[PDB]
Amino acid sequence: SAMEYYVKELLRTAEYAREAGDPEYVRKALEKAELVARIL
Amino acid sequence: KCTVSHEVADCSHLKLTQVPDDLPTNITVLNLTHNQLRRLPAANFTRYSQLTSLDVGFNTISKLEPELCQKLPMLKVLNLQHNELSQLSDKTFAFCTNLTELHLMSNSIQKIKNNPFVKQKNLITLDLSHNGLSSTKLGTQVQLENLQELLLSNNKIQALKSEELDIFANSSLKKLELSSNQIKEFSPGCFHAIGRLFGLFLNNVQLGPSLTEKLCLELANTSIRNLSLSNSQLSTTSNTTFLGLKWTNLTMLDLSYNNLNVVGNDSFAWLPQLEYFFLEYNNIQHLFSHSLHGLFNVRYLNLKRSFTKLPKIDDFSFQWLKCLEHLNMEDNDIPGIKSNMFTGLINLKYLSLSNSFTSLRTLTNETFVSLAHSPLHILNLTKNKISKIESDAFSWLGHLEVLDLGLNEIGQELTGQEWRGLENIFEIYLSYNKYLQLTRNSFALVPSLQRLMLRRVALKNVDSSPSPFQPLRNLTILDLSNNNIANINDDMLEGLEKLEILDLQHNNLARLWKHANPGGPIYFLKGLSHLHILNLESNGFDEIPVEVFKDLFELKIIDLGLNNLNTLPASVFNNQVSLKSLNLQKNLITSVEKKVFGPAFRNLTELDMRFNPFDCTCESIAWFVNWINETHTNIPELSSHYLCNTPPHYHGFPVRLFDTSSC
Ligand SMILES: *[C@@H]1O[C@H](CO)[C@@H](O[C@@H]2O[C@H](CO)[C@@H](O)[C@H](O)[C@H]2NC(C)=O)[C@H](O)[C@H]1NC(C)=O
Ligand SMILES: *[C@@H]1O[C@H](CO)[C@@H](O[C@@H]2O[C@H](CO)[C@@H](O)[C@H](O)[C@H]2NC(C)=O)[C@H](O)[C@H]1NC(C)=O
Ligand SMILES: *[C@@H]1O[C@H](CO)[C@@H](O[C@@H]2O[C@H](CO)[C@@H](O)[C@H](O)[C@H]2NC(C)=O)[C@H](O)[C@H]1NC(C)=O
Ligand SMILES: *[C@@H]1O[C@H](CO)[C@@H](O[C@@H]2O[C@H](CO)[C@@H](O)[C@H](O)[C@H]2NC(C)=O)[C@H](O)[C@H]1NC(C)=O
Ligand SMILES: *[C@@H]1O[C@H](CO)[C@@H](O)[C@H](O)[C@H]1NC(C)=O
Ligand SMILES: *[C@@H]1O[C@H](CO)[C@@H](O)[C@H](O)[C@H]1NC(C)=O
Ligand SMILES: *[C@@H]1O[C@H](CO)[C@@H](O)[C@H](O)[C@H]1NC(C)=O
Ligand SMILES: *[C@@H]1O[C@H](CO)[C@@H](O)[C@H](O)[C@H]1NC(C)=O
Ligand SMILES: *[C@@H]1O[C@H](CO)[C@@H](O)[C@H](O)[C@H]1NC(C)=O
Ligand SMILES: *[C@@H]1O[C@H](CO)[C@@H](O)[C@H](O)[C@H]1NC(C)=O
């Protein structure tokens, strides 16, 4: 499955956005990654 | 007093003068890591008959009587940190030989006296980090026969002598710290006296020329494997430096942050056994072909910021590194790729080009020819201000797995002539691009793709063509967000049955589910049987078709959030059974019904119906309160977020505080 690479993808996109300046999506991605980690 | 989990009395920060004297006698780790003690007598310690790991660091202790070791034969590790043991005695621990580790950091010892310890039958590790020692005369006779990891981390040492190490005649040293200590002399012969000196650390010490050559000659005929020369001022390299390191079987090196300005000529050819290589963070300005002679055993290379902001990497300066596997040419001002640049690196497996080029605005066909003979698995290529991709610039890459082309300025109109080849592609990172107009045949040459990332890419021509994603059949993640897409047909997902994640987040699809649209609402969520997460958020759907979610059976999270959506039709989640979550945050939902939201709340785990202004009446929220009475679903906080807003009769109340029996 791609769930593990999806929880990696959200983090990497979070650093990309943080370097680009999109804090709200950074927070949403962090919360979503934590929730998916719970559900996995 | 102190929290005890299983066998540790973690008294973390309890400023105290005496031992607790009330914990169970079978505790071992009396972790008093700051508790401001001043004496450790052999009377209160009697009860602690099973003490194993006494850690009293960051404390003020000035004396340790030998009686303390009378009652502690089971002690394994002691850690006296930041104490005041400047004065030491011969009998402070002489018979006390059962340790498995020892630490005396920052005890401010200026002298070793005569022989503070002479048996040391089981002392694996010994640390003297920030004391101020100016020698290594830890004894007078043969000792430390079982020591492995000695740490002279930061001292006032000045040189090294053969006589002072005679105590180490038969000691097997593994990793010897001599860092952060200005050494200005090396008397003839220091390390062949030591039986098994394996490692060596000389970081943050200014050696420079006229000292490095003498050191490498001094290391001759020794069994040293690792090495460390970080931050040592080394502006150049010549064939006379590291000359004495031809007889060493050295398997590691470290020459980073030392600002290697230039590389003269055949250097390092005296290191045929070097397996690792650290030259990151250098102020290098040139690279001759004969710069890297003889490094045919290096497996890792670290050149992240060696090439400084123009360098002229000469022709065939990489052909010698025949065994390189990891390349780290990340943050440099490399001016373009010459036709004879990366020739011969047939062992390469990781490229890491990102913020390296100031010339790669476009990618022509004759730009990646250098890597034709080199296998490649990861091609980073991020934010090198790429402007446009021309035809057949990736032909030479056949074993490639990741095309991580994000944070670029790729604005053009694709046709399919840029992925010529790439039959083994597993991932393309096309996010964060200016614009990308599509055709019906843009991705026909990549049927092996598994991860199509298309976020923050103004993606036009999505519906006019039959299906831009029709050729894609092995796609699992389809990230489509922040594109302002506002017109969709039954063409997104045709034959894409193994797609698992279908984010559509900042899209203008609100107008295409309405009931006034000719031909009925567009039912595009079709043909899906393996969709896990479907983020349909922040669009503006103030309507839901009754059968809009028919195909989704094994779906887990069906997030519809940040919309103006309300009045959920009945049986909207009738067929979804394995729906392990909902989310309808920031909507206009006011009334919950046992038919509208009953079958969906069966095997649930999370809810975020956060800020919707609930109508607060005995019929609007009754099943909801009777269901939140017993929460088998781990819902997030209910405090000051679920509020009664519509009816003034009972306005301003949390949901749980509703009276069920009244109605
Ligand atoms: C390390 O050991 C080698 C021998 O394995 C030493 O080489 C000898 O060098 C001396 C003069 O320097 C010659 O007279 C011998 O004939 C050499 N022996 C050989 C080549 O087998 C080398 O000098 C040693 N390194 C030192 C002492 O720094
Ligand atoms: C190290 O490099 C230097 C170059 O700086 C070499 O010195 C040259 O050696 C050749 C061959 O013996 C002779 O023409 C001169 O001694 C030098 N020529 C020039 C132009 O400098 C040196 O031989 C190399 N090897 C060692 C061990 O020093
Ligand atoms: C890379 O692309 C250039 C540009 O098309 C190619 O150069 C052409 O090559 C053909 C074949 O010999 C000539 O007939 C043309 O006159 C060349 N110029 C142009 C503008 O087309 C070049 O051959 C390509 N290289 C490879 C390896 O495919
Ligand atoms: C391509 O290189 C970039 C830049 O080094 C990588 O992005 C880094 O990813 C790691 C892993 O999460 C982060 O800790 C770094 O902060 C990221 N760098 C930056 C500048 O944000 C990226 O991961 C590489 N591509 C792949 C496929 O690994
Ligand atoms: C150690 O003492 C505590 C205190 O009662 C006890 O709960 C624990 O079982 C003891 N453990 C052992 C190994 O004796
Ligand atoms: C002892 O306490 C220190 C200070 O917090 C901590 O770093 C260390 O991990 C602890 N050791 C244990 C719990 O074994
Ligand atoms: C302590 O050291 C002595 C002397 O070497 C040895 O006989 C004894 O077994 C050791 N005990 C422990 C618990 O290490
Ligand atoms: C040399 O350093 C590497 C990397 O830290 C390590 O894996 C290796 O064990 C070290 N060599 C020795 C002899 O310990
Ligand atoms: C590496 O060279 C040194 C220098 O003579 C030698 O002592 C050592 O035995 C060599 N290593 C091996 C594995 O032979
Ligand atoms: C090193 O010296 C050789 C001598 O034959 C020469 O050909 C080569 O260009 C030199 N490399 C430099 C100066 O970088």
Side-chain angles (χ1 to χ4, degrees):
Chain A
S1 74
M3 317 288 321
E4 57 265 16
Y5 192 79
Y6 190 77
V7 299
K8 287 184 176 181
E9 213 151 2
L10 266 70
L11 276 296
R12 66 167 187 182
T13 315
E15 289 90 7
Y16 285 115
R18 197 184 95 155
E19 192 175 3
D22 200 5
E24 62 268 18
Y25 181 55
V26 173
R27 300 281 87 81
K28 287 178 179 179
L30 284 197
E31 294 294 328
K32 183 178 179 180
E34 190 276 331
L35 185 53
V36 172
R38 290 204 216 117
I39 210 63
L40 277 296
Chain B
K1 294 290 290 188
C2 300
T3 304
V4 294
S5 67
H6 308 286
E7 284 183 353
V8 297
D10 177 339
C11 311
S12 167
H13 292 77
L14 294 174
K15 312 305 174 283
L16 282 152
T17 302
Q18 206 179 5
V19 311
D21 211 4
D22 49 0
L23 276 296
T25 77
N26 65 339
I27 60 171
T28 80
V29 187
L30 183 63
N31 196 333
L32 318 169
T33 187
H34 294 89
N35 304 330
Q36 208 73 37
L37 303 162
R38 274 96 165 187
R39 42 96 176 171
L40 269 73
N44 317 115
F45 265 111
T46 56
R47 262 185 58 87
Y48 308 119
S49 164
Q50 212 165 358
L51 190 71
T52 311
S53 164
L54 170 77
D55 196 331
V56 298
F58 280 76
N59 200 1
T60 174
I61 315 169
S62 307
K63 52 188 181 307
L64 277 296
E65 46 266 15
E67 285 95 337
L68 169 81
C69 275
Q70 303 299 151
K71 271 81 179 174
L72 308 164
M74 294 299 291
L75 190 152
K76 291 305 175 188
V77 64
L78 73 164
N79 199 346
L80 296 169
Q81 287 193 217
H82 298 308
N83 290 318
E84 216 73 28
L85 272 74
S86 53
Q87 196 53 255
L88 211 65
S89 68
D90 198 2
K91 52 186 63 80
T92 181
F93 55 105
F95 72 99
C96 190
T97 54
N98 282 115
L99 322 175
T100 191
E101 170 156 324
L102 183 140
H103 288 260
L104 296 171
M105 285 79 77
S106 294
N107 292 9
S108 66
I109 48 170
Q110 320 322 112
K111 198 185 65 171
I112 317 171
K113 205 192 175 65
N114 168 60
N115 191 306
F117 53 95
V118 74
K119 313 172 188 56
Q120 273 49 43
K121 284 169 137 70
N122 297 79
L123 200 50
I124 297 89
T125 294
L126 188 153
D127 286 20
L128 311 161
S129 288
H130 289 325
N131 311 64
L133 192 46
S134 49
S135 165
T136 179
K137 192 253 183 183
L138 275 297
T140 51
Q141 280 192 335
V142 169
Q143 201 208 346
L144 283 78
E145 69 275 16
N146 291 321
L147 196 143
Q148 163 172 2
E149 190 177 359
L150 183 82
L151 280 74
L152 308 177
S153 181
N154 188 358
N155 317 102
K156 61 173 299 314
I157 322 173
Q158 284 311 293
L160 263 174
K161 303 200 173 188
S162 63
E163 49 261 19
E164 280 191 8
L165 300 158
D166 65 340
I167 49 185
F168 303 102
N170 203 347
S171 71
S172 63
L173 277 177
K174 176 66 71 69
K175 182 264 290 180
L176 185 71
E177 275 84 353
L178 270 74
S179 309
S180 290
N181 45 2
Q182 213 170 76
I183 313 170
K184 297 296 289 183
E185 214 281 337
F186 287 89
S187 79
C190 293
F191 310 135
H192 48 84
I194 298 166
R196 283 180 184 173
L197 174 62
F198 284 168
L200 189 83
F201 274 53
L202 272 78
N203 305 354
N204 260 327
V205 298
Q206 188 274 330
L207 305 179
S210 83
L211 299 183
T212 310
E213 301 84 358
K214 274 206 276 189
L215 180 136
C216 69
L217 283 177
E218 189 193 32
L219 265 65
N221 292 288
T222 54
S223 176
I224 176 170
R225 308 284 172 267
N226 283 12
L227 196 80
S228 291
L229 300 162
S230 179
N231 266 306
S232 181
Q233 297 301 319
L234 189 56
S235 80
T236 57
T237 180
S238 71
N239 57 3
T240 71
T241 318
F242 313 136
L243 159 67
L245 290 169
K246 67 182 290 294
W247 296 289
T248 183
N249 269 297
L250 207 70
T251 180
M252 185 147 175
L253 197 76
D254 186 74
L255 262 71
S256 314
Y257 268 95
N258 59 5
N259 310 273
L260 181 59
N261 206 295
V262 296
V263 174
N265 214 340
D266 271 26
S267 32
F268 338 123
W270 303 131
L271 291 95
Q273 285 83 44
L274 209 56
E275 305 300 318
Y276 278 63
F277 207 51
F278 277 66
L279 269 70
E280 181 192 347
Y281 265 94
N282 270 303
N283 62 353
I284 207 168
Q285 307 296 137
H286 208 271
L287 184 66
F288 298 119
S289 195
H290 288 126
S291 66
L292 296 185
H293 207 274
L295 300 171
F296 63 91
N297 265 309
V298 175
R299 298 294 296 163
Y300 173 83
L301 197 81
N302 190 359
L303 289 170
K304 198 173 194 296
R305 281 137 183 149
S306 189
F307 306 106
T308 313
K309 275 77 69 177
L310 60 86
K312 208 275 173 187
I313 295 90
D314 274 321
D315 291 331
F316 312 94
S317 162
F318 276 9
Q319 65 182 357
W320 279 277
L321 285 76
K322 182 69 176 177
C323 278
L324 196 147
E325 190 276 331
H326 196 281
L327 203 73
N328 189 359
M329 289 185 26
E330 168 93 6
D331 291 331
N332 295 313
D333 201 315
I334 184 168
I337 285 181
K338 308 311 285 182
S339 168
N340 290 318
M341 185 64 73
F342 296 163
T343 300
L345 301 160
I346 76 154
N347 276 289
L348 186 64
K349 294 209 206 57
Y350 189 111
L351 196 50
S352 85
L353 281 168
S354 174
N355 279 329
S356 306
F357 299 118
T358 61
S359 172
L360 265 291
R361 291 284 290 161
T362 61
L363 282 72
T364 67
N365 57 329
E366 272 282 328
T367 302
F368 270 24
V369 65
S370 46
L371 277 296
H373 301 298
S374 171
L376 206 72
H377 295 285
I378 301 299
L379 168 81
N380 198 259
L381 274 185
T382 62
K383 64 179 180 180
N384 288 278
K385 63 182 181 292
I386 307 183
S387 87
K388 68 181 178 67
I389 182 167
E390 288 263 356
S391 172
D392 312 343
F394 295 161
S395 83
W396 324 97
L397 302 174
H399 304 88
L400 194 146
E401 293 179 353
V402 162
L403 172 66
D404 186 74
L405 261 181
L407 293 175
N408 290 318
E409 314 155 325
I410 306 185
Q412 63 177 57
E413 190 268 331
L414 298 157
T415 316
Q417 294 324 290
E418 301 90 304
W419 325 135
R420 187 164 289 276
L422 294 188
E423 65 266 19
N424 292 318
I425 190 73
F426 292 165
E427 183 178 1
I428 67 151
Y429 182 69
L430 262 180
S431 188
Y432 270 70
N433 278 307
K434 261 190 189 323
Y435 70 93
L436 190 150
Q437 310 175 2
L438 285 172
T439 61
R440 65 182 180 179
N441 44 8
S442 165
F443 294 135
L445 283 188
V446 287
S448 311
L449 200 62
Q450 293 179 356
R451 185 178 296 113
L452 179 54
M453 294 178 71
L454 286 172
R455 273 197 74 257
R456 182 152 156 158
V457 176
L459 195 82
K460 291 174 71 175
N461 202 0
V462 189
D463 52 350
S464 179
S465 52
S467 296
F469 317 108
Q470 188 74 52
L472 311 164
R473 306 298 299 273
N474 273 348
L475 189 44
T476 313
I477 301 181
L478 191 138
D479 208 353
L480 259 183
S481 169
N482 294 34
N483 302 334
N484 305 85
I485 177 173
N487 204 326
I488 297 89
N489 291 318
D490 314 294
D491 57 8
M492 294 295 173
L493 270 52
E494 187 74 78
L496 281 83
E497 274 172 0
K498 69 183 292 294
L499 166 71
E500 282 176 5
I501 305 151
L502 172 74
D503 292 346
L504 282 72
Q505 184 178 182
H506 294 88
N507 298 357
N508 309 132
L509 277 78
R511 57 102 172 170
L512 57 86
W513 288 2
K514 300 294 187 291
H515 198 72
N517 312 126
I522 295 89
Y523 301 174
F524 63 85
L525 300 161
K526 201 69 176 173
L528 288 168
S529 45
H530 304 65
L531 175 50
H532 279 323
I533 303 105
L534 162 56
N535 186 28
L536 294 174
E537 184 178 1
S538 179
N539 285 354
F541 300 107
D542 44 355
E543 190 277 331
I544 284 180
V546 194
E547 291 86 4
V548 65
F549 290 129
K550 286 299 294 295
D551 58 328
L552 314 174
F553 283 140
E554 67 94 24
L555 187 153
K556 297 174 149 201
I557 320 171
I558 192 66
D559 292 331
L560 300 93
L562 272 76
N563 298 346
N564 52 358
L565 188 153
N566 53 343
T567 71
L568 268 296
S571 72
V572 61
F573 301 100
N574 187 295
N575 60 6
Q576 311 202 353
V577 290
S578 184
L579 183 62
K580 284 196 137 194
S581 190
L582 277 296
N583 197 334
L584 294 99
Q585 184 178 182
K586 296 214 218 313
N587 285 298
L588 214 61
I589 298 169
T590 57
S591 281
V592 188
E593 197 63 33
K594 329 160 193 284
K595 329 170 193 168
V596 175
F597 286 140
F601 291 179
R602 280 210 186 104
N603 210 2
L604 191 140
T605 313
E606 288 273 324
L607 291 174
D608 284 328
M609 293 182 286
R610 255 198 184 183
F611 289 172
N612 58 186
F614 269 99
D615 191 294
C616 189
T617 57
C618 76
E619 272 295 323
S620 84
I621 46 173
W623 197 244
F624 192 56
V625 296
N626 283 343
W627 176 80
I628 62 170
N629 179 31
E630 53 271 14
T631 64
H632 283 85
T633 64
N634 305 114
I635 58 179
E637 62 273 52
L638 311 183
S639 64
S640 296
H641 284 314
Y642 301 180
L643 297 171
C644 300
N645 297 114
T646 303
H649 178 233
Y650 182 76
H651 67 277
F653 283 98
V655 169
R656 185 177 293 279
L657 294 174
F658 208 71
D659 189 358
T660 62
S661 64
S662 55
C663 201

